[PDB]
Design a binder for this molecule. Structure first.
Ligand SMILES: N[C@@H]1[C@@H](O)[C@@H](C(=O)O)O[C@@H]2[C@@H]1O[C@@H](n1ccc(=O)[nH]c1=O)[C@@H]2OP(=O)(O)O
Ligand SMILES: [Cl-]
Ligand SMILES: [V+3]
Length: 216
């Protein structure tokens, strides 16, 4: 039994998990967290279940993918996030805080002060949902992908793949989509990555934060 006392929990995000992320510089500069969230367990159940749009692109497009997305919009800002769980309003407030800017600056020596961001729920949940090898758009100065699954059968597919080239097989590292894990990097001419296609209809739940100066 635990003690009859308080315990410290400064924020939804453990900013020290960003400052002290695993940091690669080759193949490209990318941070990988563990235990990003101070209270991870309830986040899976609170992830939104409606409001998504399915989207796909095939070989006609410069990247291929199949997934569903629900963006945070100005409508959510104006209605005090009434259509989302309270934890997503808190996440938005923390991403928009000086603390997040300070953590990123310490981790990767990039200053995001005064930049803009988008924030969206990206759900992969049908067999074959994936995204093909891509760098991210160069208009993006930083991308931070956060995962929310409480459990994940690795044999399901769905790993984030860090790649050495535009080739699904040229894998340098993998990240499992488990709550607390996240990946943040500046898009560059060689920041190749992908998501291994799902082999099962199992929901793989993420949020992407996209930071930029020029709208895209
Ligand atoms: N966020 C990722 C990221 O991969 C990014 C990049 O390339 O950095 O491209 C983004 C991609 O999701 C696509 N998407 C789809 C529906 C929507 O509402 N918003 C949205 O962003 C778009 O892909 P496109 O169709 O090639 O433009
Ligand atoms: Cl500008
Ligand atoms: V990407």
């Amino acid at each position: 039994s635990s003690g009859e006392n308080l315990y410290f929990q400064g924020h939804m995000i453990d900013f020290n998990a960003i400052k002290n992320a695993e940091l690669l510089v080759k193949p490209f500069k990318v941070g990988i967290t563990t235990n990003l969230f101070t209270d991870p367990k309830p986040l899976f159940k609170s992830y939104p279940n409606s409001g998504f749009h399915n989207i796909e692109k095939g070989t006609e497009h410069e990247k291929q993918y199949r997934f569903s997305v629900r963006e945070i919009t100005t409508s959510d800002l104006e209605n005090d996030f009434k259509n989302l769980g309270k934890c997503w309003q808190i996440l938005y407030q923390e991403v928009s805080s000086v603390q997040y800017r300070d953590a990123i600056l310490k981790a990767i020596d990039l200053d995001i002060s005064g930049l803009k961001f988008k924030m969206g729920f990206y759900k992969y949940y049908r067999t074959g949902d994936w995204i093909s090898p891509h760098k991210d758009k160069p208009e993006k100065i930083l991308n931070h992908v956060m995962f929310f699954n409480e459990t994940w059968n690795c044999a399901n597919g769905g790993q984030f793949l860090g790649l050495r080239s535009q080739n699904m097989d040229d894998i340098v590292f993998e990240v499992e989509p488990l709550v607390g894990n996240s990946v943040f990097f500046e898009p560059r001419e060689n920041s190749w990555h992908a998501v291994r296609p799902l082999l099962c209809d199992q929901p793989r739940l993420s949020v992407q934060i996209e930071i930029f100066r020029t709208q895209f």
